[PDB]
Design a protein around this ligand. Structure first.
Ligand SMILES: [Zn+2]
Ligand SMILES: [Zn+2]
Ligand SMILES: [Zn+2]
Ligand SMILES: [Zn+2]
Ligand SMILES: [Zn+2]
Ligand SMILES: [Zn+2]
Ligand SMILES: [Zn+2]
Lengths: 84, 57, 56
DNA sequence: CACGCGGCAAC
DNA sequence: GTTGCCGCGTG
DNA sequence: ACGCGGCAAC
DNA sequence: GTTGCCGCGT
């Protein structure tokens, strides 16, 4: 019954969402194993891994220099650096 | 353009305020009912903040 | 542990296998179109396993 | 420089 | 699917 | 029959 | 953030 508030709900479904939005300081989050990103839901971590840290069979060049990358996350951080 | 006149969210770009006002604060002809109570709204932002307030409070 | 006669799913209980056969492997007179191409399926399992292969 | 498009990414 | 963020393309 | 639990695409 | 998903314990 939301041990934090002790506020009551009819179903456990909406109680979990009350905790995720209001009591986000008490939910065990998930640290990505490849970068400094922390993510609340584990399903969102799966997408983050699939999209950011998947080995690209091909290679995508930096839009500025002649460097090639086989991962999305490394490519984006590299192109961000070209501003310093 | 930094602050929005109809709500509290802050925006950096000028064009991003256009899409914000046009999506959140535009007037809809046909009203939309709240999924929980009997309220009806004509503004997207008013519906979202109300509908969130039910199961989030 | 019981094996479905139409897919590699394994179910523990007979009652759950019936529900699986009903919901997954049943026939649908009006076919459902794939969410990503023009393919049409009369069985839920075939549609699902096909649609998942669009991540390739 | 303004403006609008479209992709981005955790929620 | 949301929404602001941003890179970049037209003027 | 009923409801959760981890998961996933939008 | 929403909502449907399904095998499984109740
Ligand atoms: Zn609470
Ligand atoms: Zn990561
Ligand atoms: Zn570079
Ligand atoms: Zn506003
Ligand atoms: Zn309402
Ligand atoms: Zn089966
Ligand atoms: Zn298809």
């Amino acid at each position: 019954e939301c041990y934090i508030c002790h506020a009551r709900f009819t179903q456990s479904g909406t109680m979990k969402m009350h905790i995720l939005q209001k009591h986000t300081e008490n939910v065990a989050k998930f640290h990505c194993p490849h970068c400094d990103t922390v993510i609340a839901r584990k399903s969102d971590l799966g997408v983050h891994l699939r999209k950011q840290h998947s080995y690209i069979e091909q290679g995508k060049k930096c839009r500025y220099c002649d460097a090639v990358f086989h991962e999305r996350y490394a490519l984006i951080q590299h192109q961000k650096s070209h501003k310093n | 353009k930094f602050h929005c006149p109809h709500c509290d969210t802050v925006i950096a770009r000028k064009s991003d305020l256009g899409v914000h006002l046009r999506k959140q604060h535009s007037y809809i002809e046909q009203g939309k009912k709240c999924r929980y109570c009997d309220a009806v709204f004509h503004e997207r932002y008013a519906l979202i903040q109300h509908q969130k307030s039910h199961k989030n409070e």
